[PDB]
Design a protein around this ligand. Structure first.
Ligand SMILES: NCCCCNCCCNCCCN
Ligand SMILES: NCCCCNCCCNCCCN
Ligand SMILES: NCCCCNCCCNCCCN
Ligand SMILES: NCCCCNCCCNCCCN
Ligand SMILES: [Cl-]
Ligand SMILES: [Cl-]
Ligand SMILES: [Cl-]
Ligand SMILES: [Cl-]
Lengths: 291, 292, 291, 292
């Protein structure tokens, strides 16, 4: 009961974890970096006093972020990650047998170097010959290269939290920068912030509605991440249908992904994409568009 | 913001709500009772320092606890609540037009009387002529009468070897006391504790497995409750099938329940009853059975 | 263990009290006002999230603030309080049999009204015919009236915490506004902030040294107030000697103060005014002057 | 500032220090051991979640515990410490040029070894040829040998009916075990717990009164220790008088102690030994005596 990490997850709500140690610290010009060894959730990466990922449950976030998008694609070969940095999104992508190139594009090289040093789980990923790490703003990087991708993965900070990432959630970004970089049949997925019965209105509903303005097919889905103290959300978007059965997803996971997923099977995905009454209605009624 | 309610979810995890006021604090010999006015979740009922119900989201717990059971029943008329006390379970049950009688059987009259006075959301419920409040141990109450019920609802504290609720979660209780007091087609539902990816192993899987030893059809389901900082669980159990589609559930809700549910439609229940890979497998492989 | 009031008494130090209730709230234009019913210290007055006084131990602060100054005066009849507001400083002054006028001069009428309503302990004081409550800045009020006083009592906020009160600790204020309002033989006392072995350097040492520039005789003294999580300080200042024995103080307390003091006797005062080695040396070496 | 060390001073009061790091955490079967790097107070030694010593202000506790006793003694050569363990008590004792031998008798060798390695302030002390470390219960150690001492120093945990230190605070211990092992002119000093206006009644007054039953001259004294969030107390006890002026104490310090004290001069001790009105009277009227 002695030592605690405390985070105010909203103005009137605090989440505190007991600590074993403060393992490593760092800073970049951009943000303070800490790896805490926490009692409830293991090793926790904290950026400017905000938890990013925890050892015990980051697999849920990263499996949910990555696998549904790739599984719905008939043959995904190259993927661009906007953000990432920790190595975990790349790790999950690199489990797919069809993938021959992963680009991880994140502005903060010291975070990437910190994670390559200290997030043991991603050592194999960071050494895989298919991974290229680009240190740049993702918008500038997409704009400046002609390569198109089968899948693009948004693994950036939530939009409302500041300026830099906000631009990467706008209708104009999606329409005029992101789509031209998707191959025919391409799939976009983004993390879409909290997706709780009330917390979902902060950004999840707006991200969903913004994507609805741009892509023909949009599938929001969500899952509990214990260390985040909330349900978290993601949104798939494509100009081709996003419709697979639990059974087809399972067959695809067996065919295409090395080793067994820990969190996600077909039925889990079907559950995740079946939102509750209130959340579904709220997503339906949402009028705000990043724009 | 200087004033906080703090709860130790686990010994190593604390969940803190900023406080507007402390509306009441007190105690029976069973437990201390407090009603807090919290900023994030509104008015919150706390028993022995453990949050029970918050105003903003208790509808989730009570709709999930009540509606799936009654909706799977062909025509539920008579229901018995083990515990409850706050009136919210009763409130949701009384939304069903099929219902003729609800018995609320709680051991702590001071909690009932507190909530009857202070939880104004339940004032209608508490004054409904269909409601009977009995102050008793639920095992004693059930065993002492031959009346049977269409649905019996477990709304008790989580089981803890050596606590007073524990006996109401055992195999022998379910087999020898509860099952004999269910009518033909009867459905049991209990709250079943935390149901998180890791937290589900403390009691949810055990409750599921204990029920699997007694009833033919057992349906575990879960939903997030923000004020609880976890996914929470419930389990349906019956000797008649529990297999309705989303749409059939919505039809039944429209026909049978007064006003629109806030949380639960049929798709929500189907989603709730599809557990994740790890939790499904953990439940399947669980060998713990609560006994005596 | 459920409900807590937390205060950051410095940037890296937090003090938290368990709560029974939040009794009354208020605000003025100047500050948010709260009366908390705390488990360890009883009813606690909190102004803009800073504890002012607690029921169980405010007697220590108010007895220490008031009695030594009056007891060292041969016959104190009128007293002006810069600040106060709660009624407790006035309460202690009104126990002296020699006193025929107390002026309480505080800028915030709603705090005074709040305390007259809710600080039960000071009901008799607030009804005593000798008390006048003036709603004004103390500097403006001293400047604008010709009356002089036997004792002036500084019961204001610490100087470094903001602007309004800071001016009431400067060498120029003391020299040119405060002294001209002291009668021949008059005594000044001010609360002088934290007086801990390290905390004393924030303001206590500076207040002491500032008064040393202005008055011939200056006596700093201190005492623990549990609810304040520190030793607290006061400074006496006069152009006449401030030298009484414990025995003489005791005789005077018996002659001049109605009822028994709870905290202070002569020996207690002698102890209070005997500071520790490090604190004494630090006060000696202090060069900062509010100025 | 996101990371905090928290200590429950009382069940209703918490005192929290921002944390730089957790330098070590561990345990013997007696107690968990942690060394924290705190922002306000530097490195802090915590035993079973209770702060023992902080770097910025431990000098206050250890100078107050040690110097008054030795200075009131005419020529103290041989001293026995009950407890200690951290090395700081020993360190202050070894500043006295009169001293020929210090015995540190602590029950928990893991605490001694931890501090010998991690408290670099005490490295000199621990390597001083005048220091002997004995791992034993202090009652057993004293009773088992006929060696007597000029000063015996109690540096143990506060007494708690049923804890292992408790016996070292009883009337019978002091009379029948400790007093026989003091030399002519011998002085006992113990730490005596919180000594706040209200907190002093938990143990400080009891310790004072227990000693008043055994020794002729008993001098309670106190001082603030910021990291402790309270005034702390100690008590001197002797069958020879304990009445020196501030100036005589300063003379003795100059003559006998290596380097300048940081906290304690003679005036400080006289101030420390003048308790406030309420505490003086509370001590005077105390009837509790620690027994067996
Ligand atoms: N601590 C509350 C939970 C916050 C969780 N945030 C999840 C989104 C992760 N985004 C990573 C951004 C990496 N560039
Ligand atoms: N641990 C934080 C959340 C706990 C919430 N408990 C939900 C189950 C409610 N059961 C209590 C029934 C009335 N005694
Ligand atoms: N909470 C930390 C302790 C702060 C105590 N402050 C004591 C000074 C009181 N001054 C009162 C000012 C009234 N106008
Ligand atoms: N409760 C917070 C402060 C407690 C400080 N304790 C001081 C007494 C030190 N005694 C321990 C002796 C070695 N076991
Ligand atoms: Cl990544
Ligand atoms: Cl109920
Ligand atoms: Cl006043
Ligand atoms: Cl030692």
């Amino acid at each position: 009961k002695s030592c605690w990490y405390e985070e105010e997850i909203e103005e009137n709500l605090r989440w505190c974890f007991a600590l074993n140690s403060i393992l490593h610290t760092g800073a970049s010009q951009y943000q303070d970096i800490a790896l805490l060894d926490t009692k409830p959730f293991g090793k926790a990466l904290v950026l400017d006093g905000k938890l990013q990922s925890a050892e015990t449950d980051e697999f849920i976030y990263h499996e949910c972020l990555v696998h549904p998008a790739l599984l719905h694609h008939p043959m995904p070969k190259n993927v661009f990650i906007m953000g990432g940095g920790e190595g975990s999104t790349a790790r999950e992508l690199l489990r797919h047998k069809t993938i021959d190139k992963v680009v991880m594009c994140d502005i903060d090289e010291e975070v990437v170097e910190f994670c390559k040093s200290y997030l043991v789980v991603n050592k194999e990923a960071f050494h895989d010959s298919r991974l290229e790490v680009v240190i740049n703003d993702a918008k500038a990087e997409l704009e400046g290269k002609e390569e198109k991708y089968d899948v693009i993965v948004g693994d950036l900070a939530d939009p409302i939290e500041g300026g830099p990432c906000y631009k990467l959630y706008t209708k104009d970004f999606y329409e005029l920068t992101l789509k031209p970089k998707l191959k025919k049949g391409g799939i976009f997925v983004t993390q879409a912030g909290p997706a709780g019965i009330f917390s979902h209105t902060e950004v999840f509903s707006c991200i969903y509605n913004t994507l609805r303005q741009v892509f023909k097919y949009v599938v929001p889905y969500s899952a509990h991440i214990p260390s985040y103290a909330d349900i978290w959300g993601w949104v798939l978007a494509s100009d081709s249908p996003l419709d697979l059965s639990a059974e087809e997803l399972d067959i695809r996971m067996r065919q295409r992904i090395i080793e067994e997923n820990r969190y996600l099977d077909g039925k889990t995905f079907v559950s995740s994409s079946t939102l509750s009454k209130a959340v579904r209605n709220s997503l339906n009624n949402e009028t705000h568009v990043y724009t």
